[PDB]
Write a protein that binds this DNA or RNA. Structure first.
Length: 183
DNA sequence: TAGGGTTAGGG
């Protein structure tokens, strides 16, 4: 049994009339559910428009995601890897992005080092190892863009990532302005 | 479209 957090999916954009039951009815098609819930207002009981489904295995979660687009109760919903309550406190943690910031890479890191590790997560579109403007010096970080936002979500939920022999920190890439609002 | 009475004691 892998961690509950890794076996869970956040489902956004849920129809007003989707219930624990209708949601389970749909997603149970890709595996056993150990949990399924529609979030609603504690007072009006009105749907908050999102919920969670948890499978018995991550392989089942992966099958569900490979089955996009997902339509529930006549509405196209948006399944996403569930971000922990702790990580959800981080700026941009819930953004739908295709690019990741990879920090703390050795000076001799080359693109193939990034490919070797990250391709396991999806189709890479662009790799950018940053250097100082005019100095040529390596800055110790890079950006990797994928073709599926889920590749990014699958990556950032994990804690460790080994590139060029050592651990590196990986976060969703935020624009200069986004971080400024979070700085 | 970000969580369900689910996050710092007492020695």
């Amino acid at each position: 049994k892998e961690p509950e957090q890794l076996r869970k999916l956040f489902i956004g954009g849920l129809s007003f009339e989707t219930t624990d039951e209708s949601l389970r009815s749909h997603f149970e098609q890709w595996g056993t559910l150990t949990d399924c819930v529609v979030m609603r207002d504690p007072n009006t009981k009105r749907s908050r428009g999102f919920g969670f489904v948890t499978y018995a295995t991550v392989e089942e979660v992966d099958a569900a995601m490979n089955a996009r687009p997902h339509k529930v109760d006549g509405r196209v919903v948006e399944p996403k890897r569930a971000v922990s309550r702790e990580d959800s406190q981080r700026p941009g943690a819930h953004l739908t992005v295709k690019k990741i910031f990879v920090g703390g890479i050795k000076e001799d890191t080359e693109e193939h080092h990034l490919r070797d590790y990250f391709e396991q997560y999806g189709k890479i579109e662009v790799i950018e190892i940053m250097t100082d403007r005019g100095s040529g010096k390596k800055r110790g970080f890079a950006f990797v863009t994928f073709d599926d936002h889920d590749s990014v979500d699958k990556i950032v939920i994990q804690k460790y990532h080994t590139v060029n022999g050592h651990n590196c920190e990986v976060r969703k890439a935020l624009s200069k302005q986004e971080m400024a609002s979070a700085s």
